[PDB]
Design an enzyme around this catalytic site. Sequence first.
Site, mmCIF file in Angstrom:
data_model
loop_
_atom_site.group_PDB
_atom_site.id
_atom_site.type_symbol
_atom_site.label_atom_id
_atom_site.label_comp_id
_atom_site.label_asym_id
_atom_site.label_seq_id
_atom_site.Cartn_x
_atom_site.Cartn_y
_atom_site.Cartn_z
ATOM 1 N N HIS A 14 18.841 -31.010 30.382
ATOM 2 C CA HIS A 14 18.438 -30.030 29.362
ATOM 3 C C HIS A 14 18.657 -28.621 29.874
ATOM 4 O O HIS A 14 19.249 -27.743 29.192
ATOM 5 C CB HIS A 14 16.941 -30.240 29.036
ATOM 6 C CG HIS A 14 16.276 -29.055 28.375
ATOM 7 N ND1 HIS A 14 16.628 -28.587 27.116
ATOM 8 C CD2 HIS A 14 15.275 -28.247 28.811
ATOM 9 C CE1 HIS A 14 15.845 -27.560 26.796
ATOM 10 N NE2 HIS A 14 15.048 -27.305 27.831
ATOM 11 N N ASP A 35 43.806 -6.316 25.294
ATOM 12 C CA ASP A 35 43.309 -7.642 25.650
ATOM 13 C C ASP A 35 42.500 -7.458 26.922
ATOM 14 O O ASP A 35 42.143 -6.322 27.264
ATOM 15 C CB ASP A 35 44.432 -8.655 25.853
ATOM 16 C CG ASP A 35 43.940 -10.064 25.560
ATOM 17 O OD1 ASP A 35 43.351 -10.717 26.448
ATOM 18 O OD2 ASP A 35 44.067 -10.520 24.409
ATOM 19 N N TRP A 49 16.832 -28.922 37.733
ATOM 20 C CA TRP A 49 18.083 -28.168 37.746
ATOM 21 C C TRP A 49 18.267 -27.416 39.065
ATOM 22 O O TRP A 49 19.370 -26.908 39.325
ATOM 23 C CB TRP A 49 18.143 -27.187 36.552
ATOM 24 C CG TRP A 49 17.409 -25.875 36.717
ATOM 25 C CD1 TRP A 49 16.042 -25.668 36.711
ATOM 26 C CD2 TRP A 49 18.010 -24.587 36.929
ATOM 27 N NE1 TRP A 49 15.781 -24.311 36.884
ATOM 28 C CE2 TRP A 49 16.967 -23.638 37.000
ATOM 29 C CE3 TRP A 49 19.333 -24.151 37.028
ATOM 30 C CZ2 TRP A 49 17.217 -22.248 37.242
ATOM 31 C CZ3 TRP A 49 19.591 -22.765 37.227
ATOM 32 C CH2 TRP A 49 18.542 -21.843 37.331
ATOM 33 N N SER A 58 34.560 -20.992 37.026
ATOM 34 C CA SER A 58 34.842 -20.410 35.704
ATOM 35 C C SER A 58 34.231 -19.015 35.605
ATOM 36 O O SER A 58 34.889 -18.044 35.215
ATOM 37 C CB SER A 58 34.245 -21.322 34.626
ATOM 38 O OG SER A 58 34.293 -20.685 33.345
ATOM 39 N N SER A 59 32.952 -18.902 36.018
ATOM 40 C CA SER A 59 32.256 -17.650 35.819
ATOM 41 C C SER A 59 32.702 -16.603 36.838
ATOM 42 O O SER A 59 32.747 -15.418 36.505
ATOM 43 C CB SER A 59 30.734 -17.831 35.908
ATOM 44 O OG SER A 59 30.189 -18.335 34.669
ATOM 45 N N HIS A 86 17.505 -16.335 41.079
ATOM 46 C CA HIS A 86 16.898 -15.190 40.400
ATOM 47 C C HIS A 86 17.968 -14.315 39.755
ATOM 48 O O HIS A 86 17.862 -14.057 38.535
ATOM 49 C CB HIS A 86 15.933 -14.336 41.262
ATOM 50 C CG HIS A 86 15.315 -13.337 40.353
ATOM 51 N ND1 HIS A 86 14.257 -13.675 39.528
ATOM 52 C CD2 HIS A 86 15.841 -12.228 39.790
ATOM 53 C CE1 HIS A 86 14.096 -12.794 38.573
ATOM 54 N NE2 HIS A 86 15.034 -11.877 38.732
ATOM 55 N N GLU A 107 20.610 -15.172 38.528
ATOM 56 C CA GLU A 107 21.056 -15.937 37.359
ATOM 57 C C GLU A 107 20.200 -15.671 36.127
ATOM 58 O O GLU A 107 20.716 -15.668 35.013
ATOM 59 C CB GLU A 107 20.994 -17.455 37.715
ATOM 60 C CG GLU A 107 21.251 -18.345 36.471
ATOM 61 C CD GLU A 107 22.632 -18.173 35.838
ATOM 62 O OE1 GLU A 107 22.780 -18.604 34.676
ATOM 63 O OE2 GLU A 107 23.568 -17.624 36.450
ATOM 64 N N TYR A 118 18.706 -12.913 35.364
ATOM 65 C CA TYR A 118 19.096 -11.588 34.847
ATOM 66 C C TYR A 118 20.482 -11.645 34.232
ATOM 67 O O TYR A 118 20.766 -10.960 33.232
ATOM 68 C CB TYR A 118 18.958 -10.517 35.962
ATOM 69 C CG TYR A 118 17.448 -10.439 36.299
ATOM 70 C CD1 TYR A 118 16.583 -9.748 35.415
ATOM 71 C CD2 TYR A 118 16.880 -11.113 37.406
ATOM 72 C CE1 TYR A 118 15.173 -9.752 35.612
ATOM 73 C CE2 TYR A 118 15.517 -11.049 37.632
ATOM 74 C CZ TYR A 118 14.668 -10.407 36.738
ATOM 75 O OH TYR A 118 13.310 -10.420 36.923
ATOM 76 N N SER A 153 20.493 -3.818 22.106
ATOM 77 C CA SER A 153 20.716 -2.374 21.951
ATOM 78 C C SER A 153 21.624 -2.062 20.771
ATOM 79 O O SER A 153 21.356 -1.137 19.984
ATOM 80 C CB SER A 153 21.328 -1.765 23.239
ATOM 81 O OG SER A 153 20.319 -1.733 24.253
ATOM 82 N N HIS A 193 9.964 -15.279 45.277
ATOM 83 C CA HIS A 193 8.865 -15.560 44.344
ATOM 84 C C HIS A 193 8.990 -16.943 43.689
ATOM 85 O O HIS A 193 8.034 -17.373 43.048
ATOM 86 C CB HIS A 193 8.703 -14.477 43.249
ATOM 87 C CG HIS A 193 9.876 -14.307 42.311
ATOM 88 N ND1 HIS A 193 10.370 -13.053 42.001
ATOM 89 C CD2 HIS A 193 10.607 -15.187 41.575
ATOM 90 C CE1 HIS A 193 11.364 -13.168 41.124
ATOM 91 N NE2 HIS A 193 11.536 -14.462 40.838
ATOM 92 N N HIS A 194 10.083 -17.668 43.936
ATOM 93 C CA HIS A 194 10.187 -19.082 43.572
ATOM 94 C C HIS A 194 9.670 -19.983 44.672
ATOM 95 O O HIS A 194 9.810 -21.217 44.585
ATOM 96 C CB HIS A 194 11.631 -19.435 43.251
ATOM 97 C CG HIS A 194 12.124 -18.649 42.077
ATOM 98 N ND1 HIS A 194 11.864 -19.051 40.778
ATOM 99 C CD2 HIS A 194 12.742 -17.447 41.991
ATOM 100 C CE1 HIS A 194 12.363 -18.146 39.942
ATOM 101 N NE2 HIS A 194 12.891 -17.162 40.661
ATOM 102 N N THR A 213 12.572 -2.366 33.142
ATOM 103 C CA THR A 213 12.580 -3.166 31.919
ATOM 104 C C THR A 213 11.769 -2.479 30.829
ATOM 105 O O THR A 213 12.141 -2.518 29.664
ATOM 106 C CB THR A 213 12.017 -4.573 32.181
ATOM 107 O OG1 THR A 213 12.701 -5.119 33.307
ATOM 108 C CG2 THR A 213 12.355 -5.499 31.005
ATOM 109 N N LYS A 270 13.631 0.011 28.907
ATOM 110 C CA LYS A 270 14.482 -0.506 27.833
ATOM 111 C C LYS A 270 13.647 -0.833 26.612
ATOM 112 O O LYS A 270 14.057 -0.555 25.490
ATOM 113 C CB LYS A 270 15.274 -1.757 28.280
ATOM 114 C CG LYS A 270 16.141 -1.454 29.520
ATOM 115 C CD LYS A 270 17.250 -2.512 29.832
ATOM 116 C CE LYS A 270 18.328 -2.668 28.716
ATOM 117 N NZ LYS A 270 19.062 -1.360 28.497
ATOM 118 N N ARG A 297 4.531 -29.376 36.174
ATOM 119 C CA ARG A 297 5.891 -29.482 35.674
ATOM 120 C C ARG A 297 6.453 -30.847 36.005
ATOM 121 O O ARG A 297 6.040 -31.485 36.964
ATOM 122 C CB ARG A 297 6.807 -28.388 36.329
ATOM 123 C CG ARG A 297 6.517 -27.107 35.721
ATOM 124 C CD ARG A 297 7.399 -26.017 36.448
ATOM 125 N NE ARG A 297 8.822 -26.205 36.119
ATOM 126 C CZ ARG A 297 9.786 -25.357 36.539
ATOM 127 N NH1 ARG A 297 9.447 -24.312 37.273
ATOM 128 N NH2 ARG A 297 11.060 -25.583 36.256
#
Lengths: 514, 43, 58, 73, 227, 46, 105, 84, 49, 144
Positions: free
Chosen positions: A61, A91, A126, A156-157, A240, A242, A244, A255, A290-291, A316, A319, A438
Amino acid sequence: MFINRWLFSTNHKDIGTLYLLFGAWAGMVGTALSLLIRAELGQPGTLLGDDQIYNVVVTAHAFVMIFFMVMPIMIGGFGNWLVPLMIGAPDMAFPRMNNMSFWLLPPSFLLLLASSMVEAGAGTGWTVYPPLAGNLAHAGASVDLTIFSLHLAGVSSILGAINFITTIINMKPPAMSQYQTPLFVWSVMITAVLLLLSLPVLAAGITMLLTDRNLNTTFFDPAGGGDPILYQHLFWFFGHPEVYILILPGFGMISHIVTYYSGKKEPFGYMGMVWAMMSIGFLGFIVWAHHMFTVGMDVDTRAYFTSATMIIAIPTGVKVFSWLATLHGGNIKWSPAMMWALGFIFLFTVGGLTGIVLANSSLDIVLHDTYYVVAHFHYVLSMGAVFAIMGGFVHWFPLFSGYTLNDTWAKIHFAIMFVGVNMTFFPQHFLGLSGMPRRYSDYPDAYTMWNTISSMGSFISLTAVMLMVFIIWEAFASKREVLTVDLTTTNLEWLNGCPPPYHTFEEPTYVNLK
Amino acid sequence: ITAKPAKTPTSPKEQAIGLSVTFLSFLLPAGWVLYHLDNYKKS
Amino acid sequence: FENRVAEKQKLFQEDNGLPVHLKGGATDNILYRVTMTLCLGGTLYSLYCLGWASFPHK
Amino acid sequence: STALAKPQMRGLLARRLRFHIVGAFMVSLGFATFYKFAVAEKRKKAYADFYRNYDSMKDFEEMRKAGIFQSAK
Amino acid sequence: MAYPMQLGFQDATSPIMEELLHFHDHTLMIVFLISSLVLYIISLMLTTKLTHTSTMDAQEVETIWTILPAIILILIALPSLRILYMMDEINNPSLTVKTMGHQWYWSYEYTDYEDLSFDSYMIPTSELKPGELRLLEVDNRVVLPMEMTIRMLVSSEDVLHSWAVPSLGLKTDAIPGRLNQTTLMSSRPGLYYGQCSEICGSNHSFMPIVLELVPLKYFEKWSASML
Amino acid sequence: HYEEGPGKNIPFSVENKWRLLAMMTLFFGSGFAAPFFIVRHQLLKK
Amino acid sequence: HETDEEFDARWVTYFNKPDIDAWELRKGMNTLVGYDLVPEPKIIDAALRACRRLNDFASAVRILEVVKDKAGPHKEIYPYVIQELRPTLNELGISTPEELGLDKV
Amino acid sequence: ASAAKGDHGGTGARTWRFLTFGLALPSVALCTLNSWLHSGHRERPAFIPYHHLRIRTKPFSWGDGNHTFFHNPRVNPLPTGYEK
Amino acid sequence: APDFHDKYGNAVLASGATFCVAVWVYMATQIGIEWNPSPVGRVTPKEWR
Amino acid sequence: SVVKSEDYALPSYVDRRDYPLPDVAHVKNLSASQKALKEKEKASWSSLSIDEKVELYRLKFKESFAEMNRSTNEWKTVVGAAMFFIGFTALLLIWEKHYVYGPIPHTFEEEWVAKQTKRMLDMKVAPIQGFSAKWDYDKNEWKK
Ligand SMILES: CCCCCCCCCCCCCCCCCC(=O)OCC(COC(=O)CCCCCCCCCCCCCCCCC)OC(=O)CCCCCCCCCCCCCCCCC
Ligand code: HEA
Ligand code: HEA
Ligand SMILES: CCCCC/C=C\C/C=C\C/C=C\C/C=C\CCCC(=O)O[C@H](COC(=O)CCCCCCCCCCCCCCCCC)COP(=O)(O)OCCN
Ligand SMILES: CCCCCC/C=C\CCCCCCCCCC(=O)O[C@H](COC(=O)CCCCCCCCCCCCCCC)COP(=O)(O)OC[C@@H](O)CO
Ligand SMILES: CCCCCCCCCCO[C@@H]1O[C@H](CO)[C@@H](O[C@H]2O[C@H](CO)[C@@H](O)[C@H](O)[C@H]2O)[C@H](O)[C@H]1O
Ligand SMILES: C[C@H](CCC(=O)O)[C@H]1CC[C@H]2[C@@H]3[C@H](O)C[C@@H]4C[C@H](O)CC[C@]4(C)[C@H]3C[C@H](O)[C@]12C
Ligand SMILES: C[C@H](CCC(=O)O)[C@H]1CC[C@H]2[C@@H]3[C@H](O)C[C@@H]4C[C@H](O)CC[C@]4(C)[C@H]3C[C@H](O)[C@]12C
Ligand code: CUA
Ligand SMILES: [O-][O-]
Ligand SMILES: [Cu+2]
Ligand SMILES: [Mg+2]
Ligand code: NA
């Protein structure tokens, strides 16, 4: 011609369309997995089986929603469609490499499918932590297919990031500085820098897991002097950044959407918005532990990570308040995209704030590995990233397709989804505070009422997903062709009509310096 | 936004068809699998 | 060696409508077909292997 | 009755904002006070009251009599 | 343990857990306030026909919305870190107990004097005695003295687990090759429940923790009874 | 060159709305259905 | 930062330019209504007279509409403005939106 | 590394001012907070007349010969121990 | 000229709200869903030992 | 009159309260009568009839401010349809409960729950606020 166009593409718009199709299909897969999760938990006892099949579902998931739905839609889809148009470029810099970033994803997805079909699946989370993910507790091919799936998604990324950074730095009109490019373009460029730096570390980490599982290395195996916690550091050094990466293109679309439907020519406080995105991207690299507040780290390290994580609230918040200040004084158009964006601002704020709760290492001892964390990240992902995606899809669907949606239907769809996601995830705060862990297929009886309500919410969101498919069908079925849109003077991507021709900006824009 | 009238307008009857077909295409396969769960956990 | 780049420039700028990966002539088509046949056949084979590996065996 | 007088015509949006942001502050203040009495002090009083005269041996003996313990029948 | 329809934390059984409750109340007040302010301001922006669409200057207002969040963060971090350092303090325990995670149960070792060890398995639902709790009871509870500072050492003999007791504010990961320490002090006798808190395979949901807190003299009688 | 304009810049046809509904139904339906059948496969496997 | 008086005078001068063209009339009004203000009668007066010089009756009515619209819920502004403008409305023969029934759905 | 920031196009005065006010001075502000926050005197340790410390092979050319140049009576013992 | 919402909106709102409440009340109360409410003020404690 | 797709590069008409004077006239091509009116408009507007003034306005603009700012009944359709679909979801949940879910565990039976509840009170579960706090241990009842 069909094969040349759709399998051999070198066109940013067609490649963007492929990504949107891919991500939509992935979103159905991810939705089905989320319903299987919530069916298992929707009453006490066991529906499917023990925690193995259940956590294969949970693991899939997450990978599907993050790597095959959100990132392809936001970066591959909106990014490819919109970034060249917003800077008047003909392009992307590497139009042919761009097509390989797309075609690596169906193989990546196939490898994830294969992982769940062979043996007993990868029931690891995951995060794929050893030793559960190692070759004794997860013997067989499933975890290796999952690692290879991530490798191909990572390549890819990374190549896509190289393409977006190069395009955005090098292919603007010669008069346009970086401080004259639209905020969505900024958001993609910063996202791309985060991908470039973080994915190779993940690649290193999962390659070490691969070799621990298959070449008798012991990077994470204490018997050889390795350390399971090293894997966690390497994973979260990517993981982390990831999150963001998952939200920043969303911020950029929000925006544009809030500016557009407020009838404004520009977002409030443009340079502050650029500053805030760069600040968030930078701080996003120095907070990963923090994880890990329960793994046993020294107290001064926990204090540093508590503090560094909380300071991300400052950019943040700039924004969030700037979006509010963009609404301020607007001639508000209550379009369905505006509804998505308003829901984003509030619900993303709630989820960011429960993130700040979790940043406190002391309280995180009790909240870690409970549903409070699940509540935090589904507010920012299911009600932030997804709302930005839905808002951008309904806003730009007429550009990409040439056809309008039925606005009343799109508003109904928003209303259903809003109820469904809040019914699903708000009670999960109570489940977390009261200690539900969890990754459980079943729970002590006291947790029944809120699990029941949460599962009922997940069915309401399913009704929204189904309705969305019908709405897209209705638009293509009726063929209301766009004539004009408002505000083209400050929304260049619209100024070549709907849809724009295959080649745009063959003659570049004229922009002088003075 | 402004737009031409629908080239091929989709009547309320047509919408009820497309909606039903769409909803069925999600619900029936999953329904079949979930209905038969017990039939699977013994084979 | 002598510099024969101008003759390659003439060949690859010939107005024959061919895409660059085929513009060198018939060798290009052979190499392309070898490559695509191996990719598509190997992919079909990989799917067969999935089907085999998805059920208990050996 | 006779001539209408000139209403305020400039800065109407800013005036509205200022008034309501101040109003929002007042409500925030008020709410902070409610919450500190209905929630935080309530909780502090509840724990302080519970323990002020708590007899842990008496509590244990009651649980013991009710048969809750494995190790103390 | 949790009870039906619970909204918040389990009642605090240890002083550190009470500190977390008060800290959470403080932080949740701030979360509710900021959330509600953002919701209100959204509604304020959306409910006037008055307009102002020309360029707005942003510098002055951005001081306020960086300095005010900075102050709020400091007001969260100060008590947060006070509690963090309190948890870490030298506490000089009178007892050390080890727990080892396994797939899927906990074992416990009391090796200060006698070499006592035992396994602790979930009671299957079919074997529960009437009135006992589904998924939470164990056959052998962690007997411990109340009102005493106890050192718990946590590790694993296979995959990761995590040893948690919410009402004591405890959660310590169980990692093979590593010995993690936490401190346990129950203000009260009774039975305190927790569950494995790191995904560990097939029966992750089914390897609970049960502490049994009793007066010291009764703890001594129990240990003495194991010779 | 390729065809351009509404309904022409996509790898699927919108020439007939009922053919389209079938296509879209197969497309989204197959993705939504796949997890249910994988779960069935694993439950049946052993 | 100019005084209100200097702002108003700049805008009166703008619309009073004898050879102001249609583009400039539209640019001026569309810019002015972006500000957080309802324009002073002296500005509106100059704008309506520019409409006269440009033989554009419809834009004159439209300007009265947007003045009312910019007041939002402040219902006293438009009657005061119309009051201050009535000599000019009479001189030029400008019917108000309400007189033309253009204030009704 | 690329750090995590993003701009260029042109490195110019505007970008470096952006970095000065948006990254450099905020970092100084943060470290100033951190520091003036961990200040507050430490307990001075017991005096022990270690022979490798408080070295005197020649009197200093100032004061009474026996005080270091930025002698702090609170935390700098003399060879015979803390003064006054 | 009256649009879809003028012609049908009142009926859609009334019928939609009616159907919704009725079906959810039925689901919540008539099909054996276990909500597991609090025993406080509800359950009479019964001897177990 | 008729806007065409080949025209996205041209100025267009908009009814927007903050763009009161759009880039083009609503009516681009005038009839003989309409051109006559525009000639009359060059004379004193006092000589224009009301009907003629309205016609000049409707040449230039599509909707008046009152017209473009009108409220609608759309919210009724949106809210009622959303409730319809949320109601439809409960049908799915009913179906799930009927065909998918089996019995829940025996610990939810009334007698089990009564016994469980006593044992929780006997171990003084959450005795400061959460649970046993709400039992009167003297009067042997729930605190009224
Ligand atoms: C769109 C609707 C879809 C349907 C789904 C629901 C959506 C959510 C809307 C629901 C809107 C509810 C607004 C506040 C809810 C707090 C409930 C509560 O009593 O909280 C209790 C605490 C823990 O408290 C305790 O330790 C003891 C509690 C009991 C005190 C003693 C009283 C005894 C009786 C209890 C009576 C109940 C009191 C409730 C009091 C209620 C006061 C409000 O739990 C928590 O921290 C959980 C929250 C974690 C972080 C979320 C905060 C941000 C929310 C602000 C805007 C709402 C966004 C919602 C998101 C959506 C909002 C638009
Ligand atoms: C889009 C995705 C996303 C985003 C943007 C975020 C944003 C944040 N996250 Fe979250 N997070 C996740 C997705 C995300 N997270 C995921 C998936 C996990 C789980 C990983 C796993 O274990 O699987 C997770 C886990 C996670 C943890 C670990 C908890 C644990 O496992 O025990 C923590 C802890 O610090 C955390 C904190 C935060 C913080 C502080 C932010 C901040 O960036 C939020 C900042 C925003 C605001 C604060 C709101 C707006 C601000 C204002 C209105 C200004 C005023 C506010 C204040 C003064 C406070 N997150
Ligand atoms: C983007 C990420 C994402 C999203 C969107 C979601 C959406 C949902 N998630 Fe998921 N979830 C995760 C990421 C996400 N989740 C992660 C990372 C984990 C942790 C994994 C772990 O523990 O290892 C997790 C874990 C998780 C759990 C906990 C499992 C456990 O601990 O045992 C649960 C339980 O309810 C859950 C439920 C749901 C539900 C009901 C939804 C629903 O809200 C989904 C509803 C549907 C949508 C939101 C639409 C999606 C589709 C599109 C947007 C495409 C639209 C098409 C076009 C625009 C063309 N999730
Ligand atoms: C930023 C704050 C500090 C800034 C710098 C301050 C002084 C710098 C002066 C020059 C530094 C050059 C080196 C001199 C050597 C020692 C100075 C070291 C820095 C200093 O100032 O050291 C101080 C001692 O100074 C002492 O002895 C005596 C200090 C004075 C005597 C100097 C003697 C002359 C040195 C000869 C230089 C030769 C250079 C040759 C260069 C040739 C290159 C081709 C330390 O004080 P303390 O009380 O011991 O401890 C602190 C207790 N609370
Ligand atoms: C476990 C095993 C996992 C295996 C995964 C394997 C996945 C990949 C299969 C790779 C097949 C690669 C085939 C060759 C690709 C060449 C790309 C290239 O060279 O791209 C160039 C651009 O990238 C540039 O320069 C920048 C430099 C070139 C980058 C080439 C990188 C190849 C990818 C390798 C993986 C990198 C991951 C790095 C971090 C760990 C050119 O871009 P084009 O758009 O083409 O043309 C533009 C025209 O103007 C040129 O005339
Ligand atoms: C989590 C997402 C899933 C949401 C729930 C889906 C909503 C329900 C959809 C209906 O699905 C159908 O339900 C029938 C039962 O109503 C099943 O027929 C079954 O039951 C009938 C009667 O008991 C027999 O006639 C059939 O042969 C037998 O296959 C049928 O297979 C299934 O397709
Ligand atoms: C977490 C990481 C160790 C990863 C590893 O075990 O492989 C370590 C390496 C360097 C450490 C940092 C450095 O020691 C510098 C700082 C020292 C402070 O006491 C804590 C924060 C501080 C910033 C440390 C945080 C954290 O422990 C770091 C970042
Ligand atoms: C200097 C730079 C760019 C200005 C420009 O060239 O347009 C601006 C853009 C955003 C600004 C920052 C943001 O407005 C956020 C902070 C606001 C505080 O009022 C000052 C520091 C603060 C950190 C600002 C410093 C500086 O003025 C920044 C960084
Ligand atoms: Cu052991 Cu989870
Ligand atoms: O990761 O937050
Ligand atoms: Cu993180
Ligand atoms: Mg954990
Ligand atoms: Na279950």
